[PDB]
Design a protein around this ligand. Structure first.
Ligand SMILES: Cc1nc(N)nc2c1CSCC2
Ligand SMILES: Cc1nc(N)nc2c1CSCC2
Lengths: 207, 207
C-alpha cells in the first residue's frame, strides 16, 4: 500500500521556490541535513538520560554520509530519534507552514536562501540538488516508513520492508548536473566548511 | 520547600568557564536566550498541530523582553513549551553534559564563546552578564516551578506561587557593571543585530 498526499500549499510553494530560484550556493543543503541529524541525535540522547531503554534500538549516536556514483545518490544517515508515520506526514516533524512564512518574510527583508535553516525548514533545501528525495525512518514508537517526493505538489508514504533499528536516512537522488556532491573531496570540503563542530562523529563512506 | 541540587561537574566547569574567561562580546547572551525561547515556541506549536488543546494554556506565541532598572533585571519571557520539574533539574532540558564536551573540544579547535549555542548550552551564556539567574517555568504537564542559581556549583528548585499559564521566564539579575543591557537602545541594537529574523513577535517593554 502506497498512500499519496498533497503537500500543504505553503510547503509546495516553498519547494517550488527552492527549485526554481537562481542560487549558486547549493552546498548549504548538506549543512542543513547534518544539522537536522544533529538535532535528532540530541533528542534521543536527551530522552535516554531519563530512560536508557530508549537506546535499546541502538546505542551508537552518529551520522554517516554515503555517496554512490552508480545510483547517483548521496545518503545522510543518523541514529537520531527518527520519525513516526504521523511525523512524516506532518511535514517530517517540522513547523513547515509557519516556518515557510517567517522564511518568506525574511527573504523580503533581505534574507538569503542559506538562512532557510533558521526557520525550521532546512530539510527542503535537499531540493537544491536532488530531483527526488527518499526518507527512510524508524522511531522507537512506530514501524519503519519510507517517505518520498519529487516535488510537484505530492509525496508518498509506505511501510518500508532493510531494518535500521532507529533513525533516519535521507536519500538524495541528485540532479544530473549536481554529481559533484558525490565526490569525496567536495564532500570533505563542505563538511569542514559548514559542519566542523557538530557533536557526533561524521563518517564519510568511500566507494 | 526549597530543594538544593549540585550541578553536574561538567556543567559547573562550563559555568565557571563562562564566568571567568575574558571575553568582551557579552551581548550574545540575548541572542542565545531568544533562540531558546524560539525553539520552545516551535515545540508547543508543533504539538498543537495535532492536539490544539495543548494551547488551552494560552494561544499567543510570543517573546517579551522586560528591563527593570530598579531591580537591575532583564527578563526574557516566552509562551513556549515550558519545562517540567524533571526538565529543570536535568539541566533545563538541555543535553548539557555532552554539549559541554563538544563545546570544549570546539574551543580547542579554535571555536569562540559566541558559538556556545551550536552545542545546546547557550542558556548558560546568561552568566556572561548575570550574577544570578532565576527561571520561572510552566509546562502543560506539571506545576509552575522556580529554578535559581548564582553559580558556585549549586541550584535550587521550588514550586512557584504569579501564574503564567504556559512558558518560561528567564530573569537575569545583572552584574553591576552590565547595566547597559537595561537600556532600550542597547537592547534594540542587539535584537536587530542578532535576532532580526526570529519567527515570533519580540516586544521590548518600556519603563
Ligand atoms: C527526526 C528527524 N531526523 C532527521 N534526520 N531529519 C528530520 C527530522 C524531523 S525534523 C526535520 C527533518
Ligand atoms: C523549554 C525551554 N524554554 C526556554 N525559554 N529555555 C530553555 C528551555 C529548555 S531548553 C534550554 C533552556
Amino acid at each position: 500500500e502506497v498512500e499519496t498526499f498533497a503537500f500543504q500549499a505553503e510547503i509546495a510553494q516553498l519547494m517550488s521556490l527552492i527549485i526554481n530560484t537562481f542560487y549558486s550556493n547549493k552546498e548549504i543543503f548538506l549543512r542543513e541535513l547534518i544539522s537536522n541529524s544533529s538535532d535528532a541525535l540530541d533528542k534521543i540522547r536527551y530522552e535516554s538520560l531519563t530512560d536508557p531503554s530508549k537506546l535499546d534500538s541502538g546505542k551508537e549516536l552518529h551520522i554517516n554520509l554515503i555517496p554512490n556514483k552508480q545510483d547517483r545518490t548521496l545518503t545522510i544517515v543518523d541514529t537520531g530519534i527518527g520519525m513516526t508515520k504521523a511525523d512524516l506526514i506532518n511535514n517530517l516533524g517540522t513547523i513547515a507552514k509557519s516556518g515557510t512564512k517567517a522564511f518568506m518574510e525574511a527573504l523580503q527583508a533581505g534574507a538569503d536562501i542559506s538562512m532557510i535553516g533558521q526557520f525550521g525548514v532546512g530539510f527542503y533545501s535537499a531540493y537544491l540538488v536532488a530531483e527526488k528525495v527518499t526518507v527512510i525512518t524508524k522511531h522507537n514508537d512506530d514501524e519503519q516508513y519510507a517517505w518520498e517526493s519529487s516535488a510537484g505538489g505530492s509525496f508518498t508514504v509506505r511501510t518500508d520492508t532493510e531494518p535500521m533499528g532507529r533513525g533516519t536516512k535521507v536519500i538524495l537522488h541528485l540532479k544530473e548536473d549536481q554529481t559533484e556532491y558525490l565526490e569525496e573531496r567536495r564532500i570533505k570540503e563542505i563538511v569542514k566548511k559548514h559542519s566542523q563542530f557538530i557533536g557526533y562523529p561524521i563518517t564519510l563512506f568511500v566507494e
